Amino acid sequence: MVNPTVFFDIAVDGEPLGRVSFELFADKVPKTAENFRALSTGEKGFGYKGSCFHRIIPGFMCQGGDFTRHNGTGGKSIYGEKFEDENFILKHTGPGILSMANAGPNTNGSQFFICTAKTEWLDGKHVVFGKVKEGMNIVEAMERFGSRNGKTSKKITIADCGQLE
Ligand SMILES: CCOC(=O)CNC(=O)N(Cc1ccc(N)cc1)Cc1cn(C)nn1
């Protein structure tokens, strides 16, 4: 019944920064939420631990989850390489929204982004499946290492991750 919570412990060139936790809307997008959950625990034998935020645009979003190519071209879901857009019930309402990156319709893998602004233009094209619960301050700190073109000035990693509670 209860939506699951997952955490990322974030590091900046290897130096611990802080924890970000997320509520995953399993009640509204269960297939998508379960993929992110499972990738955060690593229970299928692959996942986010050790991966980076490869693209960070201040005033827009922080993107990550490419654990296979490390640069935005890769990633895979727990269901296979790519799974369908589950639904577009939830909207990109503001900072802290967690949503799937994709390369076209029905191309979800493992890549995700965390909004740091309202990104309404993505509604109905990216599946929203969670939100930051605690540590929006840590997201804002991460965001300061981005740039206009998205290249990061220091390496922003998920040092550890998993499920809370
Ligand atoms: C705000 C969300 O934007 C996207 O998802 C657009 N596509 C996307 O970002 N990527 C393409 C992508 C997304 C998901 C999958 N599964 C594969 C490719 C990853 C990427 C591209 N670049 C230059 N840096 N990162």
From Swiss-Prot:
Cross-link (Glycyl lysine isopeptide (Lys-Gly) (interchain with G-Cter in ubiquitin)): K28
Name of the protein: Peptidyl-prolyl cis-trans isomerase A
Family per similarity comment: Belongs to the cyclophilin-type PPIase family. PPIase A subfamily.
Gene3D superfamilies: Cyclophilin-like
A Pfam entry, by short name: Pro_isomerase
Gene that produces this protein: PPIA
Subunit description: Interacts with protein phosphatase PPP3CA/calcineurin A. Interacts with PRPF19 isoform 2 (via N-terminus). Interacts with isoform 2 of BSG/CD147. Interacts with FOXO1; the interaction promotes FOXO1 dephosphorylation, nuclear accumulation and transcriptional activity. Interacts with integrin ITGA2B:ITGB3; the interaction is ROS and peptidyl-prolyl cis-trans isomerase (PPIase) activity-dependent and is increased in the presence of thrombin. Interacts with MAP3K5.
Residue list for modification N-acetylvaline: V2
